[PDB]
Amino acid sequence: FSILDEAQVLASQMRRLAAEELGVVTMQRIFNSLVYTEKISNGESEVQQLAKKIREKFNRYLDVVNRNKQVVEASYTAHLTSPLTAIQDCCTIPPSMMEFDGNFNTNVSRTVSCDRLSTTVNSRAFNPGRDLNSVLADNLKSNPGIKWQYFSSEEGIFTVFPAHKFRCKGSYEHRSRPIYVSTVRPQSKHIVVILDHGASVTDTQLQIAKDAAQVILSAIDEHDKISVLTVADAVRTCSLDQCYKTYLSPATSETKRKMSTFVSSVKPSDSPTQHAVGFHRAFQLIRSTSNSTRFQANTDMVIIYLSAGITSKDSSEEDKKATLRVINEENGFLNNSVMILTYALMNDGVTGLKELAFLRDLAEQNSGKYGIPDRTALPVIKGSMMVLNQLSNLETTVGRFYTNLPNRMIDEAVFSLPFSDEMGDGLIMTVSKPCYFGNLLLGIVGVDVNLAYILEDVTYYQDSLASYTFLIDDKGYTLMHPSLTRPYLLSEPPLHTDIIHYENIPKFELVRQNILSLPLGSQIITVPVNSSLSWHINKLRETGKEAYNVSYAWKMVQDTSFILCIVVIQPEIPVKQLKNLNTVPSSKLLYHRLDLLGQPSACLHFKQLATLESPTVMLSAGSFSSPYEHLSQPETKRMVEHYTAYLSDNTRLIANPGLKFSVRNEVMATSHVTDEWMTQMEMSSLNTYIVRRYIATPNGVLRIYPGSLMDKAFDPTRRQWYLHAVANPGLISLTGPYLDVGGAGYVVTISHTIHSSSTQLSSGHTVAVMGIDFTLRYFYKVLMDLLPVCNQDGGNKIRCFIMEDRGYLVAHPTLVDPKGHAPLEQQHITHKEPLVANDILNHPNFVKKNLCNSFSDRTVQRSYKFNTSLVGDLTNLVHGSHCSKYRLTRIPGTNAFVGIVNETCDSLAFCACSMVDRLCLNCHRMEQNECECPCECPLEVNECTGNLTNAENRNPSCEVHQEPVTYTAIDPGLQDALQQCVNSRCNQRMESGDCFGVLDCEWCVVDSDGKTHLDKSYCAPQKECFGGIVGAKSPYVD
Amino acid sequence: VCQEITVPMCRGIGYNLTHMPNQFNHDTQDEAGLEVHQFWPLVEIHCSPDLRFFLCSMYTPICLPDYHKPLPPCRSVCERAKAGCSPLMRQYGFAWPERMSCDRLPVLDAEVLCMDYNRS
C-alpha cells in the first residue's frame, strides 16, 4: 500500500549503480575541472569550410568524366582513319580475381578493360577500349574511392575498366538502364503505358506485353512521370494511391514498385478492347498534370500502347474511327504535344498480317484516313511501331523507346540519386555525360562512386556540438541527414524524401524556399520547443526554454545540383569545446582490436572476443579524417600500434596519423574510468549481475569493460541508451528492454550524461554519456530484494513493476513469453497491466500519447510519454478502485516509475495490442485515452506531389529507430580454443531470487512443449532456456 | 421504476430506459458505463453493426414500465456480433466474458421473449 518510502530506497540503488559501479560522479567532477574554449558562430564559416571539402571531391569527380569524355571523343577521330574494333570479352578473362578498393566480386584489373556485347552491335562497331586503358588506369590510381568507370556506346558495346567476370548467362543491355536514358534524354518524360489485355488475348503473348511494361518502368528517373493503364474495357489505373486516378506520378522507386506489381496482376479478358476510352484517359491524365512540369520546359509527352489484333469485325472500322477521333480532339486541346508509340504482340496466327496496319495508324495518328479533320494548324509528332515475338529482346526493342524522342543535343553533366549497383554489391552514385562528335551521339561516359565515400563528409560531420549538416539536391530530395540510415550498412536504396519532412519544423518552408533558390545565404528563425524534433532539442544550451533560435546556413555545391546546409541550434549562445590537454596515462591504453593483438588473456563474453585484464577503447568511423577509408580498407596490426602510440603520446611530438579534432582530447579525458572501474571490480558484489559498463563521447570514443571487440560500423551515439540520456540530462535513464549487440540477449541499461560543468544542465552541454548493462531479470531481482511487499505472493495477485517514461517495463512479475505467443509490444505497461494502463491515462498532466512520422519505412508511430516531473503519488482515479487498487510514483532522480498493484478481485480491462504485427486497431484517428500498446499505421504520402496525402497530418518526425546493426560474429576455432570470461555455474542455483539477474543464467519455467508450466523450475545457462522456455530459439535468430 | 440511459455509448440504440443492477451486478450506470466502454474501440472499427446493440443490451438492459421481466437479446444477434468481431478480438487482445456466451441467450423454441431487431 505504501510506495513513497519504498521508492526513495529504490532510488538509492539507482545511484549506487550510476555513481559507484559506473562512475558518473567521478567523471562529472573531472569533466568539471577541465578547461574549455568557447566559440560563437552562425554557421556561415562552417558551411563555407564544409562546402570546400565536398566541392574538391566533386571537382575530382567531374574531372574524371570530363577527361574520359575528351579521350573517347578524340578516339573516334582515329576510328575514322584506323579500325578501332577490338574485342576483350569480359567472360574470357579467368587468370585470377581481386577485391581491392570496392569491386569486391571476382574482379581482376590493372590496365585491362573488358567489353560486353549487345545483340545490336555489328562487326564494324567503334571500340575505343584499346587505347582507353592508358587513361582509365591513371584515373583510378590518382583518384581512389571511385568504383566503376565505363563507356557505353550507342551501337551497344559496354566497356568497363575493372574487368570482372560477371553475368555471362545473358547480355547486359546497358542502353536500357536509367543511367543511360537520363543522359541521352535529359528531358522530363511524361510517359503513360496503355496495356490492352482484352479481345481474348492469348496468355502466350500477354507475356511479352507485361514483360515490356517492366522494361519501361525500370528505365526512367525520378524527374520523369509515369502512368500505367489496363485494357480500357474499364479504365483501371493503379490502385496503390489516390492520385494515380488523376495525375502521372514521378518515377520514384515507390511508384515503380507500385506500378510494376500492378502490371503483373493483369490477366486476359474476353471483352472487346475499348481503345478510345484508354487513349482518352491517357490524355485526361496528361492534361491534368500541371503545365508540363513547370520545370525548364524539356517536357516530352509520350503514350506507349501494347496490343494486337482486336478488330471486332462488324464495328472494327468504328473502333478504329473512335480512337483516332478522340486522339485528334484531345491532342487538339493540347498543341499536338503528345507523341504515340505502338508495339505489336504476335504469335504465328493471332495477329496475322493485317492487324499491324491499325497500330501504325495509331503511331502516325492517321486520323484523316477515317475522315476526322485535323482541326489544329499544328503538325503531329509521328510515332513508330515495332513487332514483338517470343524471341524478341525487350531491352533492345521496347527499351529503346527513348530514341524516338527529340534529341535537343544537351551536353551537360547529370548526377544520379543513390541507387543499387548492378555490377557490384552495394549502393553507388553516378555522374555521367554524353559523348558528342559533331551531330553524332557516340554514347555516354560515367563513373560510379561508393555512396559512403561521396557522403563521408556529411555523414560524420562533428565540428561542433551545437551543429549538424544535411545534403539535398535542387529538387529538395534529402541525400543525407541525421535522421537517415548510414549508407555503409544499406543493402537497398532508401525512400528519397523531401527535406521538408526530415526537418519537420513550423516556419521552415520559408527557409526551404530560400535554400532551393538562393545559392548562398543564412537566416535565423524562432521555434517553440513543444513542436520540434530531437535534433534541435538535444542541442539546447539553456534550461527552462519555451522557444529557441535556429540558424540555417546553406551554400550550393559548385557545378552540381546539390546544396549543403549547416544547422546551428541557438547560435546566440556559445558552444564549449574541450581544450587540448596533456594527461599522462596511469594505465596502458588497449585498443579494442583484440583479434589483431592476442597479447592479453582472452575469453568469450557472449558473442564477443573480450578480456578481463583491462578495458578497451574504440574509435568509430567518423573519428578518422577519412571514415570510408577506415571502413572499406582492412584495419591491420600496424595501424593499431600507430593509433595506440599517438593517443598515448604525452610528448606532443607524434604527428596526427589520421584522426579528427577533439578525438584524442576525449580519449585522455575519459582515460580516468580505467582505474575507477578496475578498483570497483575488486570490492563489488555485483560482478555477476553487470554484463558491461561503458562511456561514449560525441566524437567517437568508446571505452567498455569488459574490454570487448566491436564492429567498425558501431556508433554508440545512435543507440537508444545514448539518445535517451541526452533527452534527460542529469537524470538516471532506464532504457530497455532491448536486444544487446554483444550477445547478452535482452538487456536493460542505466545511462547518465556528463556535462561541461555542473551549473548548466542542458542537453547541448553533454560532453559524454555513460552506460551500464544488466540482464532482463536483474531489476526484478532488485525489486524483490529492496521491497518486501512484492513477496506476499509469487508476483501473482500482488505485483510490482518498474516502468520507464515510454511505458515499457524493466521490472516484472512476468517476463517469459518473448516468443511466438504474445504481441510484439508485450513488454509495455498496456499489455502486462491493462487496467492500470487505462486508469493512468485519465490522470491529468501525467500521460500524453504522441504521433510521429517515419518516412524511412512509410509508417506513423504511436507512443507514450509520462512526464518525469511527477511529484507525489498516483492511485486509482477511475478504474479498479475496489477490485485492483494500485500505487504509482516516480523513482526520485530517474526517468522511471515504480508501481504496486493489489488485485483483490477480477476486473475487465483491455488495451488493443496486435498479436500478428504492429498495426493499430484504428488507423483513422488517434484518441488520447483509448488504451492501446505502441503500434503503427501506414503513412499516406501523395507520390504525385511529394507531400502528405492529408494536410491534417503535420506530426513531427520519428528521429531514429535505426535497427540495422552488425551483431558481432563468433566462429569455431575461437569458440573451442577459448572459454567464457565469467562462468558462474547456473546449475547450482535453486531459487528464483538466486537465479534472477545473473548474466549467464535464466530461470526456466516452461517445458520444451511450448507453453506448459513446469512442475520443477530450475536455473540453467541462458543457452538452454531463452525466456524461461526450455529449448526456445535464440532472440538473434528471431 | 425504469431510468434513462446515461452512458453515451448506449444512446441511440433503439431504447433509452434501463434499470440497475444489470447482469454483471453493476450497482450504477457509471459503474456499468466504465466496463462497457472498454469495447468502444471495437465499435468504432465497425467489425459488426450488431456489436453496440449486443453490448448495450447486456450492460444496460432494456427496462419496459409494463413488462417487469428481463428482456435479453436473442442468440442470433449474439452470433452475428461474434461472427464479425471475434476473429479481430483474438488478434488485438480483446476477450468475451463467459457471461456473454451466446448459449446463455434464448433462441428465435419456447415462450422466452428476446430482442432481435432484424426479425421484428
Ligand SMILES: *[C@@H]1O[C@H](CO)[C@@H](O)[C@H](O)[C@H]1NC(C)=O
Ligand atoms: C490488498 O487488499 C486486501 C484487501 O482486499 C488487504 O487485506 C491486503 O493487505 C492488501 N495488500 C497490500 C499489499 O496492500
Ligand SMILES: *[C@@H]1O[C@H](CO)[C@@H](O)[C@H](O)[C@H]1NC(C)=O
Ligand atoms: C497551346 O498554345 C496556345 C498559344 O497558341 C496556348 O494559349 C495554349 O495554352 C496552349 N495549350 C496548352 C494546353 O497550354
Ligand SMILES: *[C@@H]1O[C@H](CO)[C@@H](O)[C@H](O)[C@H]1NC(C)=O
Ligand atoms: C506550444 O507552446 C505554445 C506557446 O509557447 C502554445 O501556444 C501552443 O499551444 C503549445 N502547443 C503546441 C502544439 O504548439
Ligand SMILES: *[C@@H]1O[C@H](CO)[C@@H](O)[C@H](O)[C@H]1NC(C)=O
Ligand atoms: C534569439 O536571439 C535573440 C537575440 O540574441 C534573443 O534576444 C532571444 O532571446 C533568442 N531566443 C528567442 C526565442 O527569441
Ligand SMILES: *[C@@H]1O[C@H](CO)[C@@H](O)[C@H](O)[C@H]1NC(C)=O
Ligand atoms: C507534467 O507536465 C505539466 C505540463 O505539461 C506540468 O505542469 C506538471 O507539473 C507535470 N507534472 C507534475 C506532477 O509536476
Ligand SMILES: *[C@@H]1O[C@H](CO)[C@@H](O)[C@H](O)[C@H]1NC(C)=O
Ligand atoms: C507540396 O509539394 C510541392 C512540391 O511538389 C511543394 O512545393 C509544396 O510546398 C508542398 N506543399 C506544402 C504545403 O508544403
Ligand SMILES: *[C@@H]1O[C@H](CO)[C@@H](O)[C@H](O)[C@H]1NC(C)=O
Ligand atoms: C428516447 O428514444 C426514443 C425512441 O425510442 C426517441 O424518440 C427519443 O427522442 C429518445 N429520447 C430523447 C431525449 O431523445
